[model samples]
Target chain A: ISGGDAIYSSTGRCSLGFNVRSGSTYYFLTAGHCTDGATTWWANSARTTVLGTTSGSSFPNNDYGIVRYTNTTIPKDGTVGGQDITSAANATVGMAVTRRGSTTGTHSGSVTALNATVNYGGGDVVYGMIRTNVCAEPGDSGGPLYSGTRAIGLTSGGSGNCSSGGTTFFQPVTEALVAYGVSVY
Target chain B: VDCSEYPKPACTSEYRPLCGSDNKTYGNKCNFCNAVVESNGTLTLSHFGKC
Candidate 1:
């Protein structure tokens, strides 16, 4: 969920799933195309350890995925440096967003559009994409796309670099929660 | 210079070299550079130069 890189060369990047319900457990959400139907979370470096794997996924139409963390030490608290992600309802268009991953570290941008369509290579398409002016590069896929204290989406794809400018897409975090039956806050 | 030994490079539309006059070709396998025999039975270089 956090502290990992995302890969976009051929999808199979990341997904979203849940551990329990409200006030109970945690869950995750991501893209189906990102995972490519594989149940493994690949580390950016070959020597790194994987967090979890794909529990359920749907591509083309939905482009959503759910992953359970295999390592409980990864932490789902969302409270780091006094910052806590307690709900998925905090996502809003036009808000400032940031992502941390292997490729790019802590780059900020603004949300441009929400609920859009994205067509990846190999004729694979994902609907309900959250479009933004944020820039992303290789190995940034499946990374968390968050705003302030709440998560908004997962890094999907983009066209350019973080230094110049580019269009990046993400899978809505709220949608992933609902689809995967996960809890928030 | 013997241009015959080191031929010109032919690249795809993406600017990816496919062949070269060096009588070698490029493949996606283990080695980026591999020797290939063209239909004319001539060797073609396909890998890009380090320079």
Candidate 2:
């Protein structure tokens, strides 16, 4: 499954994060906030095609979640938006990256910091984020953040839009892979 | 604002109460700073709170 495409649920729509796996089983990653409300994920906007089930999620402290793929009709895509996700890598400041979201499509920027914390006050707080100069919006959350062919992070949250520049933070992919005990092929 | 005194979480977490040039409340300072940086220093921090 491509990471930038939209994945819908009962409560809301979030962009798919990445196609991952554990042993022979296939799964995907996305924003925890997106998984916080719903378990069933759909590939089509009409909600006809069943994509997967939310197996685990960790929000607030971290913004990543895992969805177990139950439907095998959809072929797993190795590249997201034509960018191959060869492996997961740690983020470093000034490292250029590209992000793809359903709302904003795709844009590029540089990492600003690591282990960054963001408080969406009123309550939710995310830690160890990869803060960047990329812009994203509501539907963009749960998309992919990558550098070249390396998987970098998952689109978590940020402010502004494609019409204007903004800041977006990512939940590093390495952390998510470790938390889920999965790997990207 | 004395950032040193603010909760350690505020320093790294994307959460903080930062006002925007539009007299709106950004979820955090990073969001606020993005506006300023994107605007090429045109957007000023109105205040640090829910506007």
Top of the candidates by DockQ = 2
After aligning candidate 1 to the native by TM-score, how far in Å is the CA of B38 from where it should be?
A: 28
Q: lDDT by residue for model 1 over A3-91, one digit each (tens)?
A: 33342222223222222233554445555655554666643435266556667776666656666666666555453123455556544
What stretches of model 1 exceed 4 Å from their correct place? A1-27, A42-44, A47-50, A72-83, B1-51
> Tens digit of lDDT per residue, candidate 2, span A1-185?
68898888886678888899888999999888888868899987799999999999988899988899999799888678778888889999999999998777899999989998888653788889998989886677789999898999999886665577777889999999998899988
DockQ of 2: 0.07
Q: How many pairs in model 1 have backbone atoms within 3 A of each other, for residues 3 or more apart or on separate chains, i.e. clashes? A: 28
- Cand. 2 Cα-lDDT: 0.79
Q: Candidates' lDDT values, in order?
A: 0.52, 0.79
Worst 10 residues of 1 chain A by lDDT: A8-17
Model 2 / residue A112 / CA error / Å: 0.9
RMSD (Cα, Å) of candidate 2? 7.4
